[PDB]
Amino acid sequence: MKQDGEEGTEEDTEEKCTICLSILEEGEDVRRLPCMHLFHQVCVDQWLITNKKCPICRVDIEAQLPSES
Numbered sequence: 001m002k003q004d005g006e007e008g009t010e011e012d013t014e015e016k017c018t019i020c021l022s023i024l025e026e027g028e029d030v031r032r033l034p035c036m037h038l039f040h041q042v043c044v045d046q047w048l049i050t051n052k053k054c055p056i057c058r059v060d061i062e063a064q065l066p067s068e069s
């Protein structure tokens with residue numbers, strides 16, 4: 001959603017949602033783990049609740065540091 005060529009390459013790559021094991025969709029608001037990778041917003045949430053690590057890059061997004069409910 002692109003790249004367009006211009007210009008890949010860094011934060012906000014997207015791919016298929018991987019928590020939903022399904023393509024992303026123009027359905028609701030979306031959100032990236034500050035690792036880099038984008039997901040559905042609702043997914044980044046329920047994922048954080050279960051896996052405190054990025055699903056793709058596999059690592060803890062950081063040690064930090066919200067709470068929260």
Ligand SMILES: [Zn+2]
Nearest residue numbers: 017020040043
């Ligand atoms: Zn999802």
Ligand SMILES: [Zn+2]
Nearest residue numbers: 035037054057
């Ligand atoms: Zn990641």
